[PDB]
Design a protein around this motif. Structure first.
Motif, PDB file in Angstrom:
ATOM      1  N   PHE C 242       0.807  -1.211   0.000  1.00  0.00           N
ATOM      2  CA  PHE C 242       0.000   0.000   0.000  1.00  0.00           C
ATOM      3  C   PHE C 242       0.843   1.266   0.000  1.00  0.00           C
ATOM      4  O   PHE C 242       0.315   2.325   0.316  1.00  0.00           O
ATOM      5  N   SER C 243       2.139   1.180  -0.370  1.00  0.00           N
ATOM      6  CA  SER C 243       3.040   2.331  -0.327  1.00  0.00           C
ATOM      7  C   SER C 243       3.021   3.210  -1.569  1.00  0.00           C
ATOM      8  O   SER C 243       3.363   4.390  -1.466  1.00  0.00           O
ATOM      9  N   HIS C 244       2.624   2.669  -2.727  1.00  0.00           N
ATOM     10  CA  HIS C 244       2.578   3.471  -3.953  1.00  0.00           C
ATOM     11  C   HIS C 244       1.138   3.789  -4.351  1.00  0.00           C
ATOM     12  O   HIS C 244       0.209   3.191  -3.814  1.00  0.00           O
ATOM     13  N   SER C 245       0.944   4.715  -5.310  1.00  0.00           N
ATOM     14  CA  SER C 245      -0.385   5.076  -5.762  1.00  0.00           C
ATOM     15  C   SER C 245      -1.119   3.867  -6.332  1.00  0.00           C
ATOM     16  O   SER C 245      -2.292   3.681  -6.028  1.00  0.00           O
ATOM     17  N   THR C 287      -4.611   4.502   2.933  1.00  0.00           N
ATOM     18  CA  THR C 287      -3.499   5.064   2.186  1.00  0.00           C
ATOM     19  C   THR C 287      -3.897   5.792   0.907  1.00  0.00           C
ATOM     20  O   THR C 287      -3.218   6.732   0.488  1.00  0.00           O
ATOM     21  N   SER C 289      -4.046   4.020  -1.834  1.00  0.00           N
ATOM     22  CA  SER C 289      -3.434   3.139  -2.810  1.00  0.00           C
ATOM     23  C   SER C 289      -4.611   2.444  -3.521  1.00  0.00           C
ATOM     24  O   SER C 289      -5.557   2.025  -2.854  1.00  0.00           O
TER      25      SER C 289
END
Ligand SMILES: CN(C)Cc1csc(N)n1
Ligand SMILES: CN(C)Cc1csc(N)n1
Ligand SMILES: CN(C)Cc1csc(N)n1
Ligand SMILES: CN(C)Cc1csc(N)n1
Ligand SMILES: CN(C)Cc1csc(N)n1
Lengths: 348, 348, 348, 348, 348
Positions: C242-245, C287, C289
């Motif tokens: 879930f760290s990137h778009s 997030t 994401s």
């Protein structure tokens, strides 16, 4: 490459689907297809079918615009589907057949009539389209129409008339009389001897023989005398009896056409479809004589006279079977003392 | 090359419109779009808009799938239309704007926002799209969002949250806090200093400050004592009075969230749209205390405390205007003997 | 003796069609069937099908109320129609099959599955109904389910679960595990060795093994350590990134269920039908994401671990075919330096 | 035993509901009833009523197919409901009455008109049906029609015409002139002296007197001279004044029929129902003379001449009340210097 | 001065119809009422009734917003219509009664309940409205509710709960316990001694006695032992038997609520209306045990225990009639050797 907007573009610019490229803005609201023409919506199609609006729109756009056999003929011959065309039924405002072959992605059961799903179905083939006579030659089941001869196959001469864009006509600038061929389980059939219905209207009725001209011109008793029709109940069957609360006889379209010139009447078409025999809930406006189910057939008066004069008149009641439009039509013949009382297409 | 079947193909294969080539069979019945998946129809979209089904389907497929400003912010800023995108309103299940620019041939008033029809309209521009900051510089009217600095333009820091596919969130993997810019009649407008609503739910309510944690945890009298709120009518305004047939106060979402943990209540959203202030026909299930129009705002409790503590309490009744979500929200402040009686978003 | 009023009578008095005699007053308005109960109309059924309202009402009343195979299994096995029953698809709120055999006069293509129209269709037979095992022996095409042994027929043990009135369950008071048999072109087909999807929900997710209990309980790094999963990209594939778009991995239902306990997320089911592999437009609420097409499969974690550990990791990218629910599911396996990068049900 | 499929079977085979046994496959889509005839859907009924489609279908099938009083007569007599029949209103394409007695389970308020719910309603009784004269004799409120005498009761001779399947006619093969009887609160009423409207069409207009033959044949000034109509404003009232932008007079159907032979005109029937006096938004195509509300009555010219010649012509304006079709029709009579200026059915 | 735009104005500004002056722009599309709010349409109402959309909209806006008797009570008491109010049925999303008195011009049969059309109807009167107790004294038929004593009228204490805006509650800030009075044919009727159903939900179930607390907390055998229920078949009737394919017993809501805490189940409400006894097609998700028609009543466990312990257990089978919510509920009591086998609300 097929799309709602492309079908609509073809309708707007070509009057029908013509395989042209292009798109127009479309809006669908309920059962109606509209297109924007300079900021306002213009109706292109109102769906009267039981298919989805966009699907019926595409099939109507892709309808056959050449003279084609009338739906009643195709039905009597057992046609289930057409090869790469849509036979539009103008009497029902719907496609004549449930499915298609090579026409529309929503209704297609196959792209080509050679696919195994088409093998049990009686596919309609049109010899006027390249390769369709050969497709019929290899089809297990089918009905073929042609303008001329087919090597080896014996033809059945069809009716003089065909439907061109919903207009039943006897072609002068186009050919409407086809040769009919039928195959059941890979075997070419000998189509039976048949009479044909004339497919005329009450309002635009035209006589097609000297006997029919005499029927419309002469008085009832002088026509019956001229054509030796005494004892055949033409007074009841063809002319109609408007003296009782229940309308007597009136089963031949020419008799309704004769009455129509004198006084109007209501014809309720309670099963509005194309059929060899039609049933109407008739109300005569002048007398109030009426009949819930009045079976009407449009036979050439000469053919009807030939049929009725070729019957044995010694039994009270019997079923008389006549091949009309390739189908077996049952008639009820009622006699008394060697004379006809009534003769009508059987309400069965 | 835009079509119903191509929009449907993109929905089926890409989860939304992605400019891909291809077509799927579609059927439209009433307000529903279906696609054939192995002989059976599968629903792709049910139209809940006042636009035609196929038109609303295309706009929904072409919805902005990046975090975008919440519809209430866009409305408060006077946005009439978006430049080359669709802001989908998930609360109304419809496009946020009536017309489009470069999106759909049925709804487009222009292809590019430079066309003279767009000059009087406040066009929404997204600086994350190439050329849109420049388009805003040439637009007579518009609202621009950016992730960073635009040389020469004075920014307005917007809310921390944005809507991503109908989910209001404070981005961690994506940026949701935008710089806001507005132009009216070719002139850049100074956006006002504003509070922002928190956009929280009753069921998923989370405190966003130590004061909000204390409100949800402490009893009414110990929270009021801790935060020196005596004489500010928080018992009525924030906690709610459920002792009479008409429900007293209850205008802050955190107060409804506190009550919700103890006992349930019915909130009738009679104007179901996104707005800074919401109106509900509330029925408390425990007591039967109810109110036809209960105005509710989701302000951070600290912001609401700051607003109410910054008011003069020497007049019986007055309108207090507070800038929230860039709009001017009128409040009715009622005082007696230097203490607040009630303070609520003024009913119109 | 079948009628709208008789189907409605059975629904009102028996909860479904039970072959009882009787009629109730019915009113049809748009796509809804109502019945008069003491002067007021009560809704009996809302049509969500592409079939006419009265037709869909009858098929829904005549739905199979015994545990039946899930629609995804029937589809994977090529079932076109059922013999003398209706498999109701509760996910699509519509009949699972277009036509019927001996069920409804509007949808029936045959009264008995022995009619030649059924020969090319894969007919579903239920051995729990008298004579249906014999009907399968004479069918050219079909899928048979049984509770026990059929002399001479090689069985395929199906999934433990079946659908009973829309509830997927592993029967305790009823048998839900069937023997499966299939015929293609008059020849019994050997069903392949297969894994089965577990048919669990995100909200009601229960672990079905010690490994699944450990996945939900242990932290990511201690589960991976316990089960020797280093180098298999479970951090990406099962846990999710879930760290990137764009949301990374997240293709196993148990991983979505684990995430769901911590924070919520939006799953847009853009093709809402029952299938072995599901595709969602997922938006993570914490997030932001997101992924337009996130393929999700509900395999028992042990089965997924067995599949991924049985693959050669020496190629950059390859298609891995795995039999799940009798169908061949393609997976895209991406490796680097002998370790997995990603492994996902191949997007089509 | 009543069902949708049985009503449809009767329509298909009997042209209407005839109490026959049998069922046909039916499909309902929107407001249309279809039946399958050899694989394709054929329309049986399109609902134009405010009742549910299946309910209106049954009432239309169960319509009275004998000559019945015109709806305007029944309405003027205060008829609320019919005893065990449906008076179908062909002008509204709907049942003439809201409820039924012994006809349809959805609309029935009673099975027999002797039930206490029918006591306050004016029930229509038909002496041509066995036992209905006796039911009227015991009814508190009702309207009775008979072909002959009723012992003790004095008759009111009704109009010569009746409606047979939507065709208004003067019966030759059927009786259309009825004796009318009415009861209010158990007391037989003396029905008033009344004129009757002739119920003719513009297109099929036939004169019913020597004066009417002379009106259609002679020029305006020679007809007025022959019948001594100088000073009665027939030039305006009956012939019509097409010289100004607002169409002058034209309130008698025979005058519209005379004009119609020469040049056409548009008649907008903005309240399309059967009524003694009709209102049209008329636009004359030749001159462009028009009138928003042109009241038209079809009185026999002799009756209209008798009415106008029996009025005092000494007041500027007054209301003239005339009993037409058993109801009180108000006319506005405008005079100047002892001559008529205009005389028209009052737009009230 | 009643209008669609005025009803909509009241909904938008007052949350319901409040007799205020004003109009808002409205658009009607299909069965939905919308209003323009800053250029976009916002849904105000979706018609789920069999009445026209605009008519149902007005009746819903004019719904009674005070605590009113639950529809099941009104139905059990024979209420046909309400005096000058609308009892909204939140379970059916429709008006509880077909017609109105002094509410809406489309549905009104009268303006005041004193009109002779209301004399045979059981009119609902609300003593909390001025003049309604007197109107009940002059009504031939009616049901009266009051908060207190009416001189001379013998009261019936109704249930503790009432419906306030669709929420069934026992009022704390409002009175929900009414005195009930009924008149049949001008004569005040003695209401029977009755038990009352508790109107609880499965999801929000709360015990209302120490016995109910013990039922939910103790194990089956220790509750039966504590309350001396051996031989009363509570194991079957209240707890439910999930061991066979057909679900045994389970007729008391508290038993379903107990089961619900452990494992979920599907309850198909096939006749979705408010009634004293409810029928569900229940499918237990854990076992797969199911029953097409499972009658469920929400009686206080103490009341059910009192009913079952007051029965003679010496006959194999008999009908036991119990007055619940003023209606006579038949139960089928099955005994063997002096012990209960089953006791359930008799299926009709
Ligand atoms: C209504 N029916 C004639 C179909 C059709 C063809 S073109 C159009 N607007 N509708
Ligand atoms: C019903 N509304 C949520 C619109 C929509 C999107 S996808 C689908 N089936 N409907
Ligand atoms: C709406 N869909 C669940 C079909 C259905 C079954 S019962 C009812 N009212 N509708
Ligand atoms: C449309 N209206 C004439 C009703 C009706 C009678 S038969 C048919 N198809 N519709
Ligand atoms: C759909 N039903 C709840 C009626 C209703 C009330 S408010 C609205 N939009 N619909």
């Amino acid at each position: 490459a097929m799309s709602l907007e492309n079908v609509a573009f073809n309708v707007v610019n070509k009057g029908h689907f013509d395989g042209q490229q292009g798109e127009v803005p479309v809006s669908i609201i309920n059962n109606t297809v509209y297109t924007k023409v300079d900021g306002v919506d213009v109706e292109l199609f109102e769906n009267k079918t039981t298919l989805p609006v966009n699907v019926a729109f595409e099939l109507w756009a892709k309808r056959n615009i050449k003279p084609v056999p009338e739906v009643k003929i195709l039905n009597n011959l057992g046609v289930d589907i057409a090869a790469n065309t849509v036979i539009w039924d103008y009497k029902r405002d719907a496609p004549a057949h449930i499915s298609t072959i090579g026409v529309c992605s929503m209704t297609d059961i196959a792209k080509k009539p050679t696919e195994t799903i088409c093998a049990p179905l009686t596919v309609f083939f049109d010899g006027r389209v390249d390769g369709q006579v050969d497709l019929f030659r290899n089809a297990r089941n089918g009905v073929l129409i042609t303008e001329g001869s087919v090597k080896g196959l014996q033809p059945s001469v069809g009716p003089k008339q065909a439907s061109l864009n919903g207009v039943t006509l006897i072609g002068e600038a186009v050919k409407t009389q086809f040769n009919y061929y039928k195959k059941v389980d890979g075997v070419v059939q000998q189509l039976p001897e048949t009479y044909f219905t004339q497919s005329r209207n009450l309002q635009e009725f035209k006589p097609r023989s000297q006997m029919e001209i005499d029927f419309l011109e002469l008085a009832m008793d002088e026509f019956i005398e001229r054509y030796k029709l005494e004892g055949y109940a033409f007074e009841h069957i063809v002319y109609g009896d408007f003296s009782h609360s229940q309308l007597g006889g009136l089963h031949l379209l020419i008799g309704l056409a004769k009455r129509f010139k004198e006084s109007p009447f209501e014809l309720e078409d309670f099963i509005p479809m194309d059929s060899t025999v039609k049933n109407y809930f008739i109300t005569d406006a002048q007398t109030g004589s009426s009949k819930c189910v009045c079976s009407v057939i449009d036979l050439l008066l000469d053919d009807f006279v030939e049929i009725i004069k070729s019957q044995d008149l010694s039994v009270v009641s019997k079923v008389v079977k006549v091949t009309i439009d390739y189908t077996e039509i049952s008639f009820m013949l009622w006699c008394k003392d060697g004379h006809v009382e009534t003769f009508y297409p059987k309400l069965q």
